[PDB]
Design a protein around this ligand. Structure first.
Ligand code: SRM
Ligand code: SRM
Ligand SMILES: C[C@@]1(CC(=O)O)/C2=C/C3N/C(=C\C4=N[C@@H](C[C@H]5N=C(/C=C(\N2)[C@H]1CCC(=O)O)[C@@H](CC(=O)O)[C@@H]5CCC(=O)O)C(CCC(=O)O)=C4CC(=O)O)[C@@](C)(CC(=O)O)[C@@H]3CCC(=O)O
Ligand code: SF4
Ligand code: SF4
Ligand SMILES: O=S([O-])[O-]
Lengths: 380, 103, 436, 436, 380, 103
């Protein structure tokens, strides 16, 4: 039973509002925020998930950071709105890692807010609003669409993220590491998000070249685009006979293909996904902050871990172990990447016990050479 | 898949022709309304003709800046003619392959 | 439809908030329809999503058809169309488009604003969202094409909110929380983000670029929005003068009254605060000094890494001469390798209405829009056409900070007008003094 | 002929030994001919060289014609032909070929041996040389083609010495002085060099390679022959066990009895030896400890950089379990950029007759000789075909020390055998679960 | 006045001796060396140019290192042979930097050897055997052929080397630097020698594309080789009409040419040298030892210095100044490259006062990106 | 430049023909002695023929490994036929351009 919103399909451009952008940033600021905007002096992390900011006026704001699945219902949003109305004057915030923050201007409200949040659970038993994600621990996982919405993934996002957070949960609620550890996940090498610049990155990979739908190559795709989309120039135009019919199609040099899947992004006739072939790689040692060392890219340390829905045990076990040895060895303030670099990647491999395979050696173009070892300086 | 004035058209969920060769002037008339167009002016035809010429000659859709330069129609003008844009609008009506990548 | 989900059900256990449990509750809410809503899309939409997801988990492969081109009149992007590859098996998600909605910079909301948004999505959507997309957009996950224009109308007319960006355009900009709740903020990152968002509404809604382009604003080098890694045009806050030192405050840290890093490491016993070992010796520039009573800083050698400040936020503060650096070309691997932003402008004024920043952006677009190859990110255009060309089009003179190290190779290009005699030489003249 | 050399004359002043003054003296010696020699080439040869050089200084351009192909029967290289581009103006150097003569490893000579060599060059050459060429060869600078076979005959029959290498072959190998005169030597670099030189005489004299190939032998990481920068196949000495520590000797350094770095910094006042600041804190691995009386080393974390040893050569010594590392691919810029040797084999036995080393060389040549492109240095073949391919042909398993850091990009190649189902898939099978 | 050596041109392969290699390495060892081979315990640098090695037997060997022009006459070699016969039992050595070493087994011989060497001079007044080249100073300059023998140079070698050594001479005879400074020179980008891995490197460069001798292109050259010899793919085959005659020749895209001169190396019809165009670049910060830091490549810091025979004042002045500021700033044992990297290249430019031009920014292929600055970490 | 049996040959200081086209079977006879060859056998001719075929077809001299493979003559055998090698010997006698690079 159709319900118009006032939109007139007959006059599509009538009453059309455009270029209004989002609501101005300061529109929904809590009063204490708006008043003390740009006049903060210092802050304290009262405990995992709780912060306090002190303004020049003496005014204080308390922040309670809570975990969230990112992918959420309007039912859940409404519940948070209820909580916000109860303790925060109807105000709330989302972080850059998709955690939720509730702010109050007094200690008593803070105490009631936290006790309430900590008590809520989903029927299935999981915590609705676990408090934490602060300081030197493991916060939320920056992630993507996976099998929930994307056509190019090689793994899921929501599933593995839940499986990982369950495994490292204690670190979401405590600050016991040498430095914060950022975990990000992406379902394909497009690396939407932050995997390429995180302490620990999980990326979905393929291990087989794409299949070629010859009947549709020249119909559905712009062949020259597919040719220009290959980082290794494995894609080339070709002609193939089919049922007394010659067609313009594509040829792929399997030996030159590294299954990036980019040709499929450009051409629907080049499907690549594979249940058994698909898996995940683990990259470690990236960072975006300029603190102490310059920002770093994460490096591939595990060439392949198979998809094991719905819990991805191998993935999670491996991630937990990496955090364990990093935590037991790194200096205070030392990011995972800084630690691995200081000790030498060969010591990172021996301490972690991770296997070093031929896959880990860069072979992509001229820059690959600079990743090799031009020195006798190395530990046995 | 879709029928119009006795003509049968093989199309996708987005309403794009699966084959450039299956295109005919009648496809334009059938699609226009869905693309916010009532009358196909000469400026519409100019844009459609260009896309078709470029595709037949190059095997690819021209870049937006190329469409504008060859056509003389600035982007604003293009959107006035084709409300949904050069991709969803003009390319669909011209019979070119559906735009791909992260749109 | 109702399906069995034995695999997904296992993701309802454990401590971390479960997306499965949440999707189920939304499914249950729609089925109950306590508000007697006339659902514009299948009531079982969320259940069908769970049905498809279980299948994907079973086969280990996505079940969404390739791409999709849907949208709203007047715009070239903002909606990510998607169609299930088994529409009869899961009709609730035969059409499962995503709508990107423009969010406020720093994502501060009111319960009332969010409720109105939910009301809109309840009737015309699946009831599912993403808060938020990695680019910053509010994401309304799943609807049908006929609802697209209806939602847009309600968004613009009722919610007074626009759509976000998608395609080869200027995507939705985002910033760190900045001055709103941080003592480290060197400039109003939220205002810069909102200002530029409004300034370039046309470029955002109507793709006119060779490829996508992103802006991200960090108010200090800590990089809370990760602009250096996730935006083609990164604006990172900084100061030009000296770090402010509160002598009594540092003694208080040394005395153990103030907690190191605001207590960020309270979960473990790191011993007593050792200012010399924890800050002086950790300074990358080695420009600090601790004489047993007073801490000093050779500011001219400070690289403003933030370490000392992050460690003693009560004692050490950013300078008074504030602004920002502009770094360009960050992008994911495809095609030529991952890039982070390369320093273009060391220090630029960063105060409203931020004209100096806009000027750079526009000089970059003028060049890249015309010279960039199809589907070529700015970072790749820089690699192909050279950092020198970028400097030339932005009218910035070469400076040692534009480089981490000078070139190793001697394959140096010279400008003809700079070499005596130019490049047009006569071989017969040369042949006169150098016989074959 | 006698020419004016006002520019070159200015290079006769100053402290540094002047090549001009020396060339003039050789010119004067030939003109005097106190031995009544029947000069096989123009007596004024050296004067004409000075004449050409002055001209080049005047015009700022070389006066040698392009290339030149001269040699000795049975060999494909060893002689670098050269012809003046103004032969009528400077007839003494119309033909000015260079002869490369094989030198002893480490260049230890006897006055008698050198005398005989000079006698040969006196009569059939210009009297000028290069001691030595950058590759290690003795260089006889300037003669005429008819003398080539005459010199070779005298070299082989009288001097019992061969020619060195040139062209796309195995060039003359060289080594540091090694065990002959250094307490740091981990293996007999001179013997390895001589042994391999003799082993591959055919590859050296008769070019059979895609391009040039060099061997260089350093008896320790200090790299006195610079094998890591100037040889395609670098053999650098090392030890596997602990550094030897002489407790009394270290006290003597601390006491100031022994000079730091053997007195290498005696020209300036660096203050008193500070073992903690000068060695402990300079160790790259930070694996050393000084408790005020004794110095210890966590050998498992030592990267054997040589710093502590170079600094206290009397107290610290190389280990007893000696051998060498093999690094490959060093080369100058052309074509794809400068390269240094990349670690291939971390530890290999390095004792006569050095069969283990030879085995690696030969496995490399087998591959590169067939797969290397025309004029492609091994380093470039490695870049093009991958470090993985080099490991495969040498039968060496991948090890973390083969890399300074793992790859950043995810463009990973897998061996088809490693992947379930291989690469042959049928679209119609896939199309069954994923409709178009 | 032909004089046969016994070689029979009529019978070239008669009595032909081949594949004998050089004289065995140990053949001319001094007795003390041969006896104590591989049994050394330690050494001392008695003074600049003088070393002492102590063997397990207690035996001692004294070494006197002396400078040399590398390019030398048989007259000079004979003089050294005389000196060797007088004090060293007829034994002598040449180093890897082309210096000469005279060894003795007693202190009295050592004293007489040094005094003799230090007294000898060429008629022009230059020292024949200056003693030095040890420890933390400036030793001999590894160099090339220049205008003395090569067809591809863009500068001279012997001349500039003499001019440089005269300017830094004091450092050849003393050990006052933080660490040894290695100076190398090459006449063209072929960088024969060690310029690319030295503390200070001087390399001859061109600033104009090659000229094309169209009449001889297809006659003297293998065109495909020339095409494959260009690092920037500026070289291409072409056809050109000349006097009613069409010829197969070469075309060069001037805008893509960076004057490396490699096409001339391969094809005589592509001469490139130019008196006014040619000059030298200065590179600094390289090193081959694995001591402390891994080996480094030298980096371009001066894009162009013109050729100024015969003394190359600009070149020498600049080199001396670089050594001065390095010496005044670096830590003990700190190589020039380590110093420049520690302080940041921007501080190296400001302290040295060297101009930073657009030429210095790497623009060669994918690796160029990694030389740019991906961080906010920088000094003003 | 150089004359032989009544005919003239334009050559360089190295004794290489300036032009491949100026080559004739007589050039081989004139050059042989200078290259340590008295009689031109069929094995000599085979090598000469190959170089010429390869050059006419490719515009370049073949790599040594290519000469050996196509010719069947191992490097040792090549040097027995042409004492000065495949470059200075066979290429000169075959009339190919003088070898270049750092020879
Ligand atoms: C295309 C697709 N992406 Fe996406 N993507 C989101 C955000 C990112 C970010 C992080 C950021 O913007 O902060 C990156 C890395 C930084 C960068 O811009 O490179 C990112 C990467 C890409 C690439 C690679 C680009 C390159 O290599 O130069 C592509 C391929 C291409 O352009 O052809 C690609 N992305 N992406 C985020 C947006 C949500 C929002 O508006 O805030 C995601 C929705 C992930 C999330 O869940 O947060 C997102 C996902 C996608 C794919 C659409 C997902 C969907 O089904 O809705 C898409 C469009 C794949 C496609 O349709 O072909
Ligand atoms: C060609 C020519 N070289 Fe030469 N070259 C000598 C030595 C070197 C070294 C150092 C070493 O061997 O220890 C290098 C750098 C390391 C490396 O092998 O790359 C070096 C470079 C080159 C190149 C570049 C090679 C590349 O980029 O991959 C070429 C160009 C090419 O191969 O086509 C090249 N060189 N070279 C040294 C040898 C003396 C000896 O036998 O000991 C020199 C005589 C320099 C010296 O004075 O010590 C020397 C010089 C030359 C040129 C010949 C000089 C002459 O006139 O005799 C030559 C042959 C240029 C040419 O003929 O085209
Ligand atoms: C809420 C956030 C901002 C937003 O929403 O707009 C936010 C708040 C604060 N940040 C602050 C400190 C600094 N931040 C990081 C940097 C990272 N922080 C971002 C994230 C956020 N920061 C959002 C929250 C995300 C989440 O839910 O958890 C990242 C972006 C990302 O991960 O993708 C990012 C880059 C990570 C990287 O390097 O790789 C950094 C350097 C760390 C180091 O090197 O050691 C410190 C220095 C330090 O810790 O002492 C405080 C102390 C600033 C203040 O108030 O005085 C705030 C409180 C911090 C806290 O709670 O412990
Ligand atoms: S980037 Fe800096 S200013 Fe912005 S929230 Fe993070 S710490 Fe504060
Ligand atoms: S490389 Fe090592 S062993 Fe050889 S001479 Fe040099 S310091 Fe001694
Ligand atoms: O002689 S150069 O080719 O090494």
């Amino acid at each position: 039973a159709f319900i118009s919103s006032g939109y007139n399909p007959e006059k599509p451009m009538a009453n059309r509002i455009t270029d209004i952008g989002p609501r101005k940033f300061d529109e929904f600021f809590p009063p204490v925020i708006a008043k003390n905007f740009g006049s903060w002096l210092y802050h304290e992390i009262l405990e995992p998930g709780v912060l306090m900011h002190v303004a020049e006026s003496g005014d204080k704001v308390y922040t309670v950071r809570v975990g969230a699945a990112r992918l959420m219902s309007i039912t859940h949003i409404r519940e948070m709105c209820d909580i916000a109305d109860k303790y925060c004057g109807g105000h709330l915030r989302f972080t850059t890692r998709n955690n939720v923050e509730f702010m109050v201007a007094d200690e008593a409200s803070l105490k009631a807010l936290k006790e309430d949040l900590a008590s809520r659970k989903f029927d299935g038993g999981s915590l609705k609003f676990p408090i934490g994600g602060t300081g030197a621990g493991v916060s939320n996982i920056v992630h993507t669409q996976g099998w929930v919405h994307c056509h190019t993934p090689a793994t899921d996002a929501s599933g593995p993220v839940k499986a990982i957070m369950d495994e490292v949960f204690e670190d979401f609620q405590s600050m016991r590491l040498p430095a914060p550890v950022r975990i990000s996940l992406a379902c394909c090498i497009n690396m939407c998000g932050a995997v390429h610049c995180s302490d620990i990155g999980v990326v979905g990979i393929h291990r087989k070249p794409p299949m070629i739908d010859h009947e549709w190559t020249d119909q559905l795709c712009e062949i020259p685009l597919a040719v220009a989309s290959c980082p290794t120039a494995a894609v080339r135009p070709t002609k193939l006979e089919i049922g007394d019919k010659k067609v313009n199609t594509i040829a792929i040099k399997n030996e030159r293909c590294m299954y990036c899947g980019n040709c499929y992004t450009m051409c629907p006739a080049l499907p690549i996904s594979d249940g058994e072939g698909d898996g995940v790689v683990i990259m470690v040692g990236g960072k975006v902050s300029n603190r102490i060392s310059m920002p770093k890219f994460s490096k591939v340390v595990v060439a392949y871990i198979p998809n094991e829905p719905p819990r991805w045990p191998s993935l999670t076990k491996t991630i937990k172990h990496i955090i364990e040895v990093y935590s037991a060895n790194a200096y205070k303030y030392e990011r995972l990447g800084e630690w691995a670099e200081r000790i030498g990647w060969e010591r990172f491999f021996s301490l972690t016990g991770l296997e070093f395979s031929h896959h880990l050696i860069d072979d992509f173009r001229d820059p690959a050479y600079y990743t090799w070892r031009q020195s006798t300086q190395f530990k046995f | 898949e879709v029928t119009y004035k006795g003509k049968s058209f093989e199309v996708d969920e987005d309403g794009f022709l699966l084959r450039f060769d299956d295109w005919c002037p009648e496809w334009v008339e059938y699609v226009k309304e869905s693309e916010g167009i009532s009358d196909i002016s000469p400026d519409h035809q100019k844009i459609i003709d260009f896309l078709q010429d470029y595709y037949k000659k190059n095997g690819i859709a021209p870049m937006v800046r190329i469409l504008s330069k060859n056509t003389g129609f600035k982007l604003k003008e293009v959107y006035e003619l084709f409300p949904s844009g050069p991709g969803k609008g003009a390319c669909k009506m011209a019979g070119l392959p559906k735009p791909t990548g992260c749109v | 439809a109702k399906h069995a989900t034995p695999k997904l059900d296992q993701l309802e256990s454990g401590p971390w908030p479960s997306f499965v449990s949440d999707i189920k509750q939304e499914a249950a809410y729609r089925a109950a329809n306590p508000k007697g809503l006339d659902y514009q899309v299948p009531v079982d939409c969320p259940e069908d999503l769970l049905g498809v997801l279980e299948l994907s988990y079973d086969e280990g492969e996505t079940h969404w058809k390739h791409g999709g081109i849907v949208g709203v009149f007047g715009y070239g992007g903002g909606v990510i169309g998607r169609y299930c590859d088994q529409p009869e098996k899961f009709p609730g998600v035969a059409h499962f488009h995503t709508v990107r909605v423009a969010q406020p910079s720093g994502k501060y909301y009111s319960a009332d604003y969010l409720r109105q948004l939910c009301d809109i999505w309840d009737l015309r959507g699946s009831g599912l969202t993403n808060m938020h997309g990695s680019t910053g957009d509010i994401v309304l996950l799943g609807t049908q094409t006929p609802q697209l224009e209806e939602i847009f109308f309600e968004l613009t007319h009722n919610l007074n909110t626009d759509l976000g960006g998608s395609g080869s355009n200027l995507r939705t900009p985002e910033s760190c929380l900045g001055k709103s709740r941080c003592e480290f903020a060197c400039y109003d990152s939220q205002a810069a983000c909102y200002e530029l968002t409004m300034e370039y509404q046309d470029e955002l809604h109507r793709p006119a670029f060779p490829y996508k382009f992103k802006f991200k604003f960090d108010a200090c080098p800590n990089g809370c929005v990760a602009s250096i890694a996730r935006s083609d045009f990164s604006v990172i806050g900084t100061w030009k003068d000296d770090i402010k030192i509160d002598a009594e405050a540092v003694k208080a840290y040394v005395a153990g009254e103030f907690k190191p890093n605001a207590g960020a490491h309270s979960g473990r016993d790191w011993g007593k605060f050792d200012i010399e070992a924890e800050v002086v010796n950790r300074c990358p520039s080695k420009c600090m000094k601790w004489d047993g009573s007073k801490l000093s800083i050779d500011n001219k050698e400070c690289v403003r890494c933030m370490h000392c400040i992050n460690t003693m936020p009560r004692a050490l503060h950013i300078g008074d001469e504030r602004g920002a650096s502009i770094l360009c070309g960050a992008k994911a691997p495809i095609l030529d390798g991952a890039q982070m932003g390369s320093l273009l402008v060391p220090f630029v004024a960063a105060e409203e209405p931020f004209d100096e920043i806009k000027e750079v952006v526009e000089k970059i677009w003028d060049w890249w829009m015309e010279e960039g190859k199809n589907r070529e990110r700015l970072g790749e255009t820089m690699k192909r056409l050279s950092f020198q060309k970028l400097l030339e089009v932005t009218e910035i003179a070469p400076v040692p900070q534009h480089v981490k190290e000078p070139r190793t190779n001697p394959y140096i290009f010279f400008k003809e007008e700079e070499v005596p005699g130019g490049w047009d030489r006569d071989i017969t003249e040369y042949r006169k003094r150098h016989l074959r």
